[PDB]
Amino acid sequence: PVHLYETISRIKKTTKLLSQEMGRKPTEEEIATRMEMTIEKLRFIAKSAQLPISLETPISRLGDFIEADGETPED
DNA sequence: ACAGGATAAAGAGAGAAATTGAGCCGAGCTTAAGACCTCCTTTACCTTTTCA
To answer: Is the C-beta of residue A43 closer than 7 Å to nucleic acid chain B?
Structure first.
């Protein structure tokens, strides 16, 4: 959602501002405090911002190394 | 990008319910020994047959 894009942009801007102010890469807790949000929310945003990798990425393709969901004939 | 506005769908606050497990008990249950009554076996002695 658009609000998520705006949240990610604000997180990037805050991180750059803290890096400029403190002269070093900010930690997760520092960013979470500055954003006034829990660290778990920040990690959730970071995980949801990822781009999906295509199944045909060379490793040979990625799609030939992923098992299938089901009950093993043995089970 | 950023600000405002509308809304619904998904969290926190409390008690009351419902469970829950915990101790502390004696009621239900098992174990073992001994005695003790049916059922059966086998004997000793017969009686009771069919036959030369």
So the answer is: no
